[PDB]
Amino acid sequence: MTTQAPTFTQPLQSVVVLEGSTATFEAHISGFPVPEVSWFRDGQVISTSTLPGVQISFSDGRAKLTIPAVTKANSGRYSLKATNGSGQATSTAELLVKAETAPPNFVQRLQSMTVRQGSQVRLQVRVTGIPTPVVKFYRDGAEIQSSLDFQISQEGDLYSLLIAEAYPEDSGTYSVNATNSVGRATSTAELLVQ
């Protein structure tokens, strides 16, 4: 058939993607012989090293560039160049990444418990959210103060309140408050010591 310079039968479409979501640029390229295809970002070629995790493919005249977990550092101008003996074509689009947010959420909540005097007690919670939540523990509404008796500890999203030796004076309503720019969540439990 006829030799033909590269042409985009379907151009790249600019896209606004949510952080962490998958982003996909796709285009349909025609031409004969089949053109050589190459992707670029701000005037520089894209590859698995330039943009790790990037999946690039070109089959059945369909060129696709997929970024699994999109980051804010990926937005910008992306372009696709197609070339053969008859000429060269380029299609450029912009990637806009929208900041992701989630209110504080208790994956693991506080649980009420009744124990006998002198028992070692641990109250835990696991909290998630974006931005990272600020977590504080309360006993009957007053912020718990760290000591050998009451111990607040954190490891990632897991917060714990350890009462090494629980006595009747420690009974009460225990709660945890978690906040971030998009919301506030609270968890409450009853601790009873005989």
The Cα 167–Cα 116 span in angstroms is 8
Residues 94 and 109 in one domain: no
Secondary structure class of 111 (helix, strand, coil):
coil
Resolution of the experimentally solved model in angstroms:
2.0
Residues 1 and 33 in one domain: yes
Domain boundary among 40, 73, 98: 98
Residues 183 and 93 in one domain: no
Domain carrying residue 111 = 99-194
Domain boundary among 79, 98, 117: 98
Pairing of strands 172-180, 62-67: unpaired
Residues 116 and 183 in one domain: yes
The Cα 65–Cα 58 span in angstroms is 9
Domain count, the chain: 2
Domain boundary among 98, 122, 142: 98
Cα atoms in the 13 Å half-sphere on the side-chain side of 96: 5
The Cα 185–Cα 169 span in angstroms is 27
Alpha helices in 13-162 (DSSP H): none
